[PDB]
Nucleic acid binder design. Sequence first.
RNA 1: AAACUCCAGUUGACACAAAAUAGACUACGAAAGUGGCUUUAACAUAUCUGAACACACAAUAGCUAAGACCCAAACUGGGAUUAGAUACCCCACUAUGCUUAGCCCUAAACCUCAACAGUUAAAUCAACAAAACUGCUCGCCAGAACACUACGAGCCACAGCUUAAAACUCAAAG
RNA 2: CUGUUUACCAAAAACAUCACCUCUAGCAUCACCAGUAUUAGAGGCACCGCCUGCCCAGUGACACAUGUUUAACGGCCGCGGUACCCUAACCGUGCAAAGGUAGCAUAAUCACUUGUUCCUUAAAUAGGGACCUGUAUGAAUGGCUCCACGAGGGUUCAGCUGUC
Lengths: 39, 122, 167, 86, 70
Amino acid sequence: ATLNQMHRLGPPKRPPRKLGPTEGRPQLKGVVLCTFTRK
Amino acid sequence: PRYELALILKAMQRPETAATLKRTIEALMDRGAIVRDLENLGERALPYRISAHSQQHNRGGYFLVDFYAPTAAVESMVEHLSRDIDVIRGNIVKHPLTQELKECEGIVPVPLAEKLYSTKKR
Amino acid sequence: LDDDPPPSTLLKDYQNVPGIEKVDDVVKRLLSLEMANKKEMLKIKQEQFMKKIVANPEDTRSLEARIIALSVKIRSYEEHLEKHRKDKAHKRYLLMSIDQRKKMLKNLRNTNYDVFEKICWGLGIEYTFPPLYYRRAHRRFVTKKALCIRVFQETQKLKKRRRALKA
Amino acid sequence: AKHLKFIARTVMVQEGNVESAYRTLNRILTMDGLIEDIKHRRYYEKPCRRRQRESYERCRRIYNMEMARKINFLMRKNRADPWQGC
Amino acid sequence: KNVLKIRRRKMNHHKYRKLVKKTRFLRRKVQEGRLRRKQIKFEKDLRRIWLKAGLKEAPEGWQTPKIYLR
RNA sequence: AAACUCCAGUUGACACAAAAUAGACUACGAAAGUGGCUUUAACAUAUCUGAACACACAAUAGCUAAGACCCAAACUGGGAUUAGAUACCCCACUAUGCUUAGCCCUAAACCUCAACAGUUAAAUCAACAAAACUGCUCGCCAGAACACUACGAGCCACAGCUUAAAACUCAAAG
RNA sequence: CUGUUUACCAAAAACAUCACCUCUAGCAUCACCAGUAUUAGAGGCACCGCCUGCCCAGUGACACAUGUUUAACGGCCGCGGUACCCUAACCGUGCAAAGGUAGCAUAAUCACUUGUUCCUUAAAUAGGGACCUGUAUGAAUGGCUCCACGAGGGUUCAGCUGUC
Ligand SMILES: C[NH+](C)c1cc(NC(=O)CNC(C)(C)C)c(O)c2c1C[C@H]1C[C@H]3[C@H]([NH+](C)C)C(O)=C(C(N)=O)C(=O)[C@@]3(O)C(O)=C1C2=O
Ligand SMILES: [K+]
Ligand SMILES: [K+]
Ligand SMILES: [K+]
Ligand SMILES: [K+]
Ligand SMILES: [Mg+2]
Ligand SMILES: [Mg+2]
Ligand SMILES: [Mg+2]
Ligand SMILES: [Mg+2]
Ligand SMILES: [Mg+2]
Ligand SMILES: [Mg+2]
Ligand SMILES: [Mg+2]
Ligand SMILES: [Mg+2]
Ligand SMILES: [Mg+2]
Ligand SMILES: [Mg+2]
Ligand SMILES: [Mg+2]
Ligand SMILES: [Mg+2]
Ligand SMILES: [Mg+2]
Ligand SMILES: [Mg+2]
Ligand SMILES: [Mg+2]
Ligand SMILES: [Mg+2]
Ligand SMILES: [Mg+2]
């Protein structure tokens, strides 16, 4: 992009970091509902 | 401006051609035309059979009308000739002598075109 | 505002030819606009406007003369489209000429306001200032504002009816 | 046709040599393009197809005329080798 | 270039057109409810205006036109 | 094969359809597009760039009426082929292609190569393609796929178009 | 949709109707009409929006030379088998002029049935939304949506009350 275009647009911002299954938590506490095997 | 009426008539006898030519020249004048000259190219056989006004024509008298008229007179004169049953075919064109032929310098042979492909080993 | 150029006027090329007053009556109409194309009439119209407005009649490369020449074309395109309503190519030529004139007029206005005023008067051109926001007026908008204007007018007619409450 | 008959595409037979007349007729029709036109006019050739074919034939004529010009230019050098042995 | 990426869009589009065809009447019923909720949402907004502008009723002679109809 | 047999073949009269040759030319137009003849009108801007908050256009196909009917023709019906043949082949015929008046606004709308001003000097230069580049500006892009999608919004468009995501999935895609 | 009807047990969902479409007719001195196919008659259907599929064998009309015609009367398939079951994209065979298309479907419609499920009541054989799917739903005998309207039939909040 040109300098005028690079100015008009500004910083590259950032994709808001998507949370993980743990929701950004080191660990989580759950209650076993069922136990099975998956291939 | 200057025009030319390529007028093919119905290969009639002198009284009728003179009658027909006079009609056409007046109808030009009636629409504001200044008729410059009238030429007789002669009665030839038609290059092909022309069917006009419920008749099959094989011969016809060729005439030319050199005239000046206002640009609006062309459509009116074109329509007028449509209804004359003694005209086999009539076309109005810009006069060919109005255009000045530009001086030509000569045929210049075309050199083979170059640098169409990169000079890399394929 | 509807002054039509006389049709008998001689061509711009044969106007100055000396001694033309002694030619035959036929020759006069062969050298007139009657026997000429529509473009020959535009040369005369441009000549008349240029001598009326432009200070130096012979200066053709001046911003003023260009606006005159461009205004005669705009006139010629508008008449062409009056008969040929679906000539989209000439419709495009008109809208581009008009924008190029506004562009010439914006420059002249900002450089020589003196002659800018002379042009706008002689050619009947009314310079308008371009709108700021070119926004589409769809229904939802065209109704919102129409209401919001009526609401404002109603609130206006409640201060009138509250200064009469101070009484 | 409104034209006169027995004028166009007409060849006279000499000494009853029909084979030679029909041959010259074929040449005339081919040399003017008629034969190839009739064959291409059997089925409609769409404008995209016509342009692809005309471009191909015109690229072909150039190449063919340039190769023919190089063959004719080098034909002189097909003579016997003058330095045979070295 | 191959057309492997065109062929993906080709099938996507084909399936979508067939899907719209199969459900064009279900989709029409849903679209009618949407334009209906859309007109309500429009009126609320216009209503909100004059209520915020102190007026207790719509301006005299005002009717909210049905802009989201055919 | 079915089909036609009010059909074929010479000859004559006869378009509101489409425009051999020229064209081995490379012109016009902003692009779309434009190649039978005639006439009228007519092809913006005496710096450049620039509107996805605007305007005017935009092949083909479609839609709304009103006409035209030679041919070509989706659909459809027969004949054939086939394991089937909702195709490819044959015949027939329609929407449609044409005109007029409005819509619709999409293309591999691609020469996938922006406008303007310049340079062949260097180190040309990943591959291939249509050799490598400079200045300047605008417009666009930032793994794949979900997705020419959903929601929202606008639109004469109601199976439409334009804008256009996310979740789950993958370690590749290209 | 306003309208219309069984004067005296039915006012209605019945009829008409704007609209759409089919049929017939090239013409004057008494209807049509002192009109002339953008007309005028005979009918269907029912504004509008989205549509109106397939069938000309039969019966009628028209052509009566092979035929044409469904917005004419009408019609619009079976028998076996195959993914646990259900169903069959699929397979076999037969039959027809065509094999019921698009839609729509627990109801002005109803075997089972007061289906099932979601709402609704404390309680629903009611009503609404869906799903199942049609003894025998279905496209101008119009099909399906929708604004407005109705002394029409039905359901209902709140209130109201001697209806109780
Ligand atoms: C006694 N049978 C013959 C019958 C009767 C009626 N109704 C009457 O008889 C009503 N009689 C009155 C008019 C009240 C006097 C019926 O209404 C029915 C049926 C048949 C069934 C068949 C059902 C069946 N399944 C789902 C159990 C089935 O497979 C079909 C089918 N088409 O193959 C059905 O459609 C079926 O569900 C059905 O609809 C039936 C009836 O409707
Ligand atoms: K009543
Ligand atoms: K019920
Ligand atoms: K229920
Ligand atoms: K009533
Ligand atoms: Mg009674
Ligand atoms: Mg009464
Ligand atoms: Mg009684
Ligand atoms: Mg009563
Ligand atoms: Mg009724
Ligand atoms: Mg209707
Ligand atoms: Mg029907
Ligand atoms: Mg069905
Ligand atoms: Mg229900
Ligand atoms: Mg029953
Ligand atoms: Mg049943
Ligand atoms: Mg039935
Ligand atoms: Mg019927
Ligand atoms: Mg109403
Ligand atoms: Mg009433
Ligand atoms: Mg009611
Ligand atoms: Mg109560």
